């Protein structure tokens, strides 16, 4: 019931800048340390900064100077100000709460689901969605498989869904991979019972909001 | 600087196993801030433990942190598949703006053998008006992760145009997903007839083949 909100995470120009927002629900968190921990992709924890229960702030000896965080307790809400921006800057940018009771001790107990900061100078690119139909011999067998393929997209990420939700079992939506265009493209599977088919409608949604790209396509087989 | 080495970068083990990382400082960490955290994929970290051994709420009893100064150890006394995930340690050196975290331990799982089901998908017509076409293999709930998926067109070995993607850990039964992409451009996919997928994995006796006939 508790949990924290980031956002203002998207695509940005090299010498852009940005201000993430942290907004908690379920608690008061006026009380509380908040701190800002990134993630380059398939890297590790990075630590930036924290903003204490008083307006106090600390940043890590890299960031204090392109990052500055603030707060703003009548609204709930903890800020990031991003500057002058790198392509070295591009992460996942997450808020966290310091363990009630400490300070400078690094136990960080409640996060945030994360934000995804990309610092590039291309453009963003909206995704072709092509379905991946089952075979026609899809009968018998050992139950049949199905998906859709996203392709052609910039920057991550992009959500997959099966039938607005109602799928979800045996879904598998693949990392993306980069292809000699500089383009992410992955594809989501979904194994479901050859009886299933024909009777049972199967719609993979996807969405990219970057590009504000938003396609259902409907798998059929033929 | 600080210098924060985390050991191993990874490691596998077989559920109900005991697996041990460890962390150790350069810097001695100030009065004992030590902490780890799970983060599985997608998801952010969780803490797991803070002050070296004490276990925040909800944590199962077989987790458990000791050591001191410069070294210390996270213990998982009976590994379980749900426990696939990267594990991080952080410390604290009384300067605050020293906060640091290790490189991390890749935690994976080790089970039988399970064969592949695999499937294969011809391009679409909808992406052949757009000048290309992406035929797509897929290779679902198999163990160990290494699998051999090679594109045969009309029996010509392809080599340098395909990409292959593999899942997470699953982490109700430890298995793994790949998918394995050949893309060509039209003309080039017009231009035969037998697309076949052939897959080889140790739960396999004899490599599995996957095809279709281009338009038939």
């Known amino acids: 019931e508790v949990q924290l909100l980031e956002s203002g995470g998207g695509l940005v120009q090299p010498g852009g800048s940005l201000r993430l927002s942290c907004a908690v629900s379920?608690?008061?968190?006026?009380?509380?340390?908040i701190n800002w921990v990134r993630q380059a992709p398939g890297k590790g924890l990075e630590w930036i900064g924290i903003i204490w229960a008083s307006g106090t702030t600390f940043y890590a000896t890299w960031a204090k100077g392109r990052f500055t965080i603030s707060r703003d307790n009548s609204k709930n809400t903890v800020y990031l100000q991003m500057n002058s921006l790198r392509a070295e800057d591009t992460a996942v940018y997450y808020c966290?709460?310091?363990?009630?009771?400490?300070?400078?001790?690094?136990?960080?107990?409640?996060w945030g689901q994360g934000t995804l900061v990309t610092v590039s100078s291309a453009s963003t690119k909206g995704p072709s969605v092509f379905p991946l139909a089952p075979s026609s011999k899809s009968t018998s067998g050992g139950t049949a498989a199905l998906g859709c393929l996203v392709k052609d997209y910039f920057p991550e990420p992009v959500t997959v869904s099966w039938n607005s939700g109602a799928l979800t079992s045996g879904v598998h939506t693949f990392p993306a991979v980069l292809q000699s265009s500089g383009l992410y493209s992955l594809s989501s599977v979904v194994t479901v019972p050859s009886s299933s088919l024909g009777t049972q409608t199967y719609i993979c949604n996807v969405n990219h909001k970057p590009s504000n790209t938003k396609v259902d396509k409907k798998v059929e087989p033929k | 600087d600080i210098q924060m080495t985390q050991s191993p970068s990874s490691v596998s083990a077989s559920v109900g196993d005991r697996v041990t990382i460890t962390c150790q400082s350069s810097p001695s960490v100030w009065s004992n801030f030590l902490s780890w955290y799970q983060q599985k994929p997608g998801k952010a970290p969780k803490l797991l433990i803070y002050?070296?051994?004490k276990l925040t709420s909800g944590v199962p009893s077989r987790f458990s942190g000791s050591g001191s100064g410069t070294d210390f150890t996270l213990t998982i006394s009976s590994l379980q598949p749900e426990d696939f995930a990267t594990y991080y340690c952080g410390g604290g050196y009384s300067s605050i703006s020293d906060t640091t975290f290790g490189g991390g331990t890749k935690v994976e799982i080790k089970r039988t053998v399970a064969a592949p089901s695999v499937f294969i998908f011809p391009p679409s017509d909808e992406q052949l008006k757009s000048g290309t076409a992406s035929v797509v293999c897929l290779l679902n709930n198999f163990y160990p992760r290494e699998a051999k998926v090679q594109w045969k067109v009309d029996n010509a070995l392809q080599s340098g145009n395909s990409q292959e993607s593999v899942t997470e850990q699953d982490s109700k039964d430890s298995t793994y997903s790949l998918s394995s992409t050949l893309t060509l451009s039209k003309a080039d996919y017009e231009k035969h007839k037998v697309y076949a997928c052939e897959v080889t994995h140790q739960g396999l006796s004899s490599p599995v083949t996957k095809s279709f006939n281009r338009g038939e």
């Open positions: 002050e070296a051994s």
């Open positions: 966290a709460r310091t363990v009630p009771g400490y300070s400078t001790a690094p136990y960080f107990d409640l």
């Open positions: 379920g608690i008061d968190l006026s009380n509380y340390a």
